[PDB]
Structure 1
Amino acid sequence: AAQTNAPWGLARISSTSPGTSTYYYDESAGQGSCVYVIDTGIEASHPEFEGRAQMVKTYYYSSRDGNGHGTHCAGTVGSRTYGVAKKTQLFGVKVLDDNGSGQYSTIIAGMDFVASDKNNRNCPKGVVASLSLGGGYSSSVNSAAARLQSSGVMVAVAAGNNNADARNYSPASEPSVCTVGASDRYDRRSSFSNYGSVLDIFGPGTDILSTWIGGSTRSISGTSMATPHVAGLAAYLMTLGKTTAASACRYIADTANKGDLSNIPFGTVNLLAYNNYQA
């Protein structure tokens, strides 16, 4: 399948070259997979989600996304126009308040929630969790991410936006999950992207168009935007039967475009997420 005039990041993940604008993907499109977006929530009523998104948990007075961040990330995972995996089921878990903040205890509870809640859902092709969030190093936050992964969920987390080594941030520094840095449309490391040996992969993160609250759209930047490209790619590849939740991060790194990014510090992987879709 071909989506013309796609956002650059979608075109990038199905291309061996920067500078194109059509996204190519197998029509299965992540059908039968599930992706949990653990964030500020998701505006499930947005026409872009087509009834495939729902809120499953909140820790605040509402499950509504009063920020936009979670909606934007969920859009990059699975919206009809802005999404990588256009037929996946999206589940929102609101661990972040409408200011985009959340206590680590809440975030930990959200991760353990997903590890259990997947047993209440129909995801025959597999389960992914996208975590576009983080703060300073916490062994308890890393442990929660490690448990979620161990439970059979492909965990993708943002490297962070500090232009620093991700070893000092969580859940970015948990080795057993998939830690995602950000790139731009000219294949440069995004200016704010963290780096370091703990990164597994880069995805598109600078100037990413996606859904927003009030049934709107906008372009924003962050490792928060790179992460859902990878989460959606994993759901897409698991639907194709090419990989599993436990092995998808490794499979994505194995099949990545290699050595194409500029300003990658010595010792950080030079690997850009790629779906290797051949029509």
Structure 2
Amino acid sequence: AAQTNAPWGLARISSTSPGTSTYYYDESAGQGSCVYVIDTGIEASHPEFEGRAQMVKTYYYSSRDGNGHGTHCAGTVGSRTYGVAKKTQLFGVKVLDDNGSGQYSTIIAGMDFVASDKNNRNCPKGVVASLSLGGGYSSSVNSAAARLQSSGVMVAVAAGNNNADARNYSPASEPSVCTVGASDRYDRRSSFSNYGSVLDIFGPGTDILSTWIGGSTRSISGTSMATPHVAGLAAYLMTLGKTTAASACRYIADTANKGDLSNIPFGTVNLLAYNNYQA
């Protein structure tokens, strides 16, 4: 399948070169998979989600996304126009308030929630969790991400936006999950992207168009935007049967575009997420 005039990041993940604008992908499109977006919520009524998104949990007075961040990330996972895996099921877990903040205790509870809640959902092709969040190093936060992964969920986490080594941030620094840095449309490391040996992969993260609250759209930047590209890619590849939740990060690294990014610090992987789809 071909989506013309796609957001640059979608075109990038199906291309061996920057500078194109058509996204190519297998029509299975993540059908039968599920992606949890652990964030500020999801505006599930947005036409772009086509009834495939729902809120399943909140720790606050509402499950609605009063911020936009979670809706944007969910759109990059799975919206019809802005999403990688256009037929996946999206489940929102609101661990962040409408200012975008959350206590680590709530974030940990949300991860353990997903590890159990997947047993209440129909995801025959597999389960992914996208975590566009983080703060300073916490062994308890890392352990929660490790449990979620161990339970059979492909966990993708943002590297962080500090232009620093991600070893000092959580859950970015957890070795067993997929830690995602950000790149721009010219294949440069995004100016804010964290780096370091704990990164597994880069995805598009600068000037990413996606859904927003109020039935709208906007372009924003962050490792928060790169993470759902990888989460949606994992769901798409799991639906194709090419990998599993336990092996998808490694598979994405195996099949990535290699050595194509600029300003990658010595010791950080030079790997850009790629779907290897041959039309």
After TM superposition, the score normalised by the length of structure 2 is: 1.00
SS at match of 2:186: coil
In the alignment, the residues of structure 2 paired with residue 170 and residue 43 of structure 1 have an alpha-carbon distance, to the nearest angstrom, of: 26
Deviation, structure 1 residue 259? 0.1
Deviation, structure 1 residue 100? 0.0
CA displacement 1:230-267 (0-9 Å, x = unmatched):
00000000000000000000000000000000000000
SS at match of 2:140: helix
Deviation, structure 1 residue 10? 0.0
Deviation, structure 1 residue 69? 0.0
Deviation, structure 1 residue 16? 0.1
SS at match of 1:44: coil
Structure 1 residue runs of 5 or longer lacking an equivalent are: none
CA displacement 1:201-233 (0-9 Å, x = unmatched):
000000000000000000000000000000000
SS at match of 2:210: strand
Name the residue aligned to 2:193. Answer: 193
Deviation, structure 1 residue 141? 0.1
In the alignment, the residues of structure 2 paired with residue 23 and residue 197 of structure 1 have an alpha-carbon distance, to the nearest angstrom, of: 30
Deviation, structure 1 residue 194? 0.1
CA displacement 1:166-220 (0-9 Å, x = unmatched):
0000000000000000000000000000000000000000000000000000000
Give the ranges of 4+ consecutive aligned residues of structure 1 lying more than 4 Å apart after TM superposition. none
Deviation, structure 1 residue 97? 0.1
- Is 1:12 the counterpart of 2:9 in the alignment? no
In the alignment, the residues of structure 2 paired with residue 45 and residue 172 of structure 1 have an alpha-carbon distance, to the nearest angstrom, of: 31
Name the residue aligned to 2:184. Answer: 184
In the alignment, the residues of structure 1 paired with residue 111 and residue 214 of structure 2 have an alpha-carbon distance, to the nearest angstrom, of: 27
In the alignment, the residues of structure 2 paired with residue 278 and residue 121 of structure 1 have an alpha-carbon distance, to the nearest angstrom, of: 31
In the alignment, the residues of structure 2 paired with residue 72 and residue 104 of structure 1 have an alpha-carbon distance, to the nearest angstrom, of: 22
CA displacement 1:76-132 (0-9 Å, x = unmatched):
000000000000000000000000000000000000000000000000000000000
In the alignment, the residues of structure 2 paired with residue 68 and residue 174 of structure 1 have an alpha-carbon distance, to the nearest angstrom, of: 27
Root mean square deviation, CA, Å: 0.1
Name the residue aligned to 2:102. Answer: 102
Deviation, structure 1 residue 157? 0.1
After TM superposition, the score normalised by the length of structure 1 is: 1.00
In the alignment, the residues of structure 2 paired with residue 42 and residue 175 of structure 1 have an alpha-carbon distance, to the nearest angstrom, of: 28
SS at match of 1:230: helix
Q: How does 1:1-279 map to 2 (within 5 A)?
A: 1-279=1-279
Deviation, structure 1 residue 162? 0.1
In the alignment, the residues of structure 2 paired with residue 81 and residue 123 of structure 1 have an alpha-carbon distance, to the nearest angstrom, of: 22
In the alignment, the residues of structure 1 paired with residue 197 and residue 136 of structure 2 have an alpha-carbon distance, to the nearest angstrom, of: 17
Deviation, structure 1 residue 34? 0.0
In the alignment, the residues of structure 2 paired with residue 85 and residue 166 of structure 1 have an alpha-carbon distance, to the nearest angstrom, of: 27
Deviation, structure 1 residue 274? 0.0
In the alignment, the residues of structure 1 paired with residue 9 and residue 110 of structure 2 have an alpha-carbon distance, to the nearest angstrom, of: 28
In the alignment, the residues of structure 1 paired with residue 275 and residue 98 of structure 2 have an alpha-carbon distance, to the nearest angstrom, of: 33
In the alignment, the residues of structure 1 paired with residue 172 and residue 43 of structure 2 have an alpha-carbon distance, to the nearest angstrom, of: 26
In the alignment, the residues of structure 2 paired with residue 225 and residue 213 of structure 1 have an alpha-carbon distance, to the nearest angstrom, of: 16
Deviation, structure 1 residue 45? 0.1
In the alignment, the residues of structure 2 paired with residue 196 and residue 153 of structure 1 have an alpha-carbon distance, to the nearest angstrom, of: 24
Q: What is the identity percentage for the equivalent residue pairs of Structure 1 and Structure 2? A: 100
